[PDB]
């Protein structure tokens, strides 16, 4: 599993950075998403999938605030079954493992 870019660089004034996570595995991935800080940046989506050898886009938006050095935290497992959507069945699963991208907003 992986994130391109694996890190994020943003204007601390207000911006907006897409990245690619991508599963080069041989099974469904499931995800959910916690940021260090949840006051200027918003995360979309904060739950999700990416198929084997797949891709899920993962925004960051950032809203005006000061400069400062934070982390998207990205939990992931094995997806279950037949699961249809991530934050359900992330209710019955324990992560299996974790990806951190940095985020830096920057003056």
């Not at 099974?27 to 050898?53: C, L, T």
């Amino acid at each position: 599993l992986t994130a391109d870019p694996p890190a994020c660089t943003v204007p601390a004034a207000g911006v907006s950075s897409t990245h690619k996570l991508v599963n080069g595995g041989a099974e469904k991935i499931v995800f959910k998403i916690k940021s260090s800080n949840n006051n200027e940046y918003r995360i979309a989506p904060v739950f999700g999938f990416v198929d084997p050898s797949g891709s899920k886009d993962v925004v960051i938006t950032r809203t005006a605030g000061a400069p400062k050095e934070d982390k998207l935290v990205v939990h992931f497992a094995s997806a279950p079954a037949d699961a249809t959507d991530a934050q359900a069945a992330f209710v019955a699963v324990a992560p299996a493992g974790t990806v951190t991208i940095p985020m830096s907003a920057t003056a």
